[PDB]
Amino acid sequence: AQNPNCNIMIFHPTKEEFNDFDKYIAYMESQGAHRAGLAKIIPPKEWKARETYDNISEILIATPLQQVASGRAGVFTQYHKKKKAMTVGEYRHLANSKKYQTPPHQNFEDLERKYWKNRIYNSPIYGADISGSLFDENTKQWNLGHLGTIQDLLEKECGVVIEGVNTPYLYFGMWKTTFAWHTEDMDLYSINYLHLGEPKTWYVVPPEHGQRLERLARELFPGSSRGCGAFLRHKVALISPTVLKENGIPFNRITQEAGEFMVTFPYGYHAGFNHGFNCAEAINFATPRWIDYGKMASQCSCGEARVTFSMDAFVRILQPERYDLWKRGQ
Ligand SMILES: O=c1[nH]c(Oc2cn[nH]c2)nc2cnccc12
Ligand SMILES: [Co+2]
Ligand SMILES: [Zn+2]
Q1: Residues 192, 282: contact at Cβ < 8 Å?
Q2: Residue 96 lies in domain
Q3: Any idea which positions bind Fe cation?
Q4: Which residue in 245, 154, 167 sits closest to 203, CA to CA?
Q5: What is the phi/psi pair of residue 29, to 5°?
Q6: Cα of 285 to ligand 3 centre, how many Å?
Q7: How many domains is the chain built from?
Q8: Residue 43 in 3-state DSSP?
Q9: Are 285 and 229 in contact (CB under 8 A)?
Q10: For residue 23, how far is its CA from the centre of ligand 1 (angstroms)?
């Protein structure tokens, strides 16, 4: 078995190897990358997503989200308070203001310490989940807007044609903006490219140990757990590395910098935070190996979790037994 300790692996494809996306994902998994739940891919030195990021200030963040925390420093939930629309230019200026700017710090490790000590006492604003792409249409390799769709993958593997499309999303971040512990919808893969700005720190639990995290979450968020059997789908719960370590939960951490890809693998729980103003792009994707994860993925039926148009068909085909009750919630 490759990568038995489930370490986060870092890959350095040549431009040649970077020319077939599906093939390279398969290669990474042949080396055991998926066992970590997360991998980093550093693109070839001659590759670029686009020429410059000089013309992005007019992108609109229609619904910026203020992330308000409740709980203890190492164990908290966050809710999203909707704010008035602003452009990326306006958002960037806000992120860089005295109220929201990254504080002085010695290194990544010091900043991480400051995050977990101080996160709950501030409410940063996140420009998350914006439909769109910053890849140049002429960028041919690893263009997140030109990937094969999950619908076409499902059709290729299971012989069923389904409705739906899947497109990329943009994430404009600032210091302390946070993504809560979760797996992807239907336990899909995700691929995330950090286009510009300050880093993004990730935490991840190996897929083979996901149920250990769930068990701890039920204990740490007893109210949320009773309300919904798959409450992490709400994407609201944070647990610090210190608390994970205290409770024996296997996990790993890594910091993503501008110009780098991160891939999350099926049923790899992850969470993290942004160091300062940045912009990332992400999309879900599937491979043949995902299919069996899709069939087993837990669903929120309490109504809280966000439901996309495309999800209907994946539940309908892969989880016909769940389909009725899942549809009632949504
Ligand atoms: O970088 C990420 N940002 C992000 O934004 C959020 C949307 N809702 N709450 C946070 N979500 C992510 C989810 N999985 C991986 C990376 C991210
Ligand atoms: Co994710
Ligand atoms: Zn729920």
Answers
A1: yes
A2: 1-330
A3: 182, 184, 270
A4: 245
A5: -70, -30
A6: 23
A7: 1
A8: coil
A9: no
A10: 26
Nearest protein CA to atom 4 of ligand 1, as residue: 179
* Residue 66: exposure state from Cβ atoms within 10 A (0-12, 13-18, ≥19): middle
Quick one: CA torsion of 86, 88, 94, 95, rounded to 10 degrees?
140
Task: Provide residues with CB under 6 Å of ligand 1.
Answer: 126, 128-129, 171, 179, 192, 200, 235, 280
| d(C-alpha 308, C-alpha 25), whole Å | 25
- Angstrom distance (rounded) from CA 295 to CA 298: 9
- Return the CATH number at 130: 2.60.120.650
Q: In the numeric block, which tokens belong to residue 141?
A: 């390799």
* Chain mean position to CA 83: 22
Question: Which single residue is written with the structure tokens 């501030």?
Answer: 122
Residue 146 marked as a ligand binder: no
The residues, any chain, with a CB within 8 Å of residue 10's CB and separated by 6 or more, are: 39, 40, 41, 42
Residue recorded with tokens 């290669």: 27
- Experimental method, per PDB record: X-ray
Cα(114)–Cα(85) distance, integer angstroms: 29
Q: Match 């094969």 to its residue by tokens.
A: 148
Tokens of 197: 């700005």
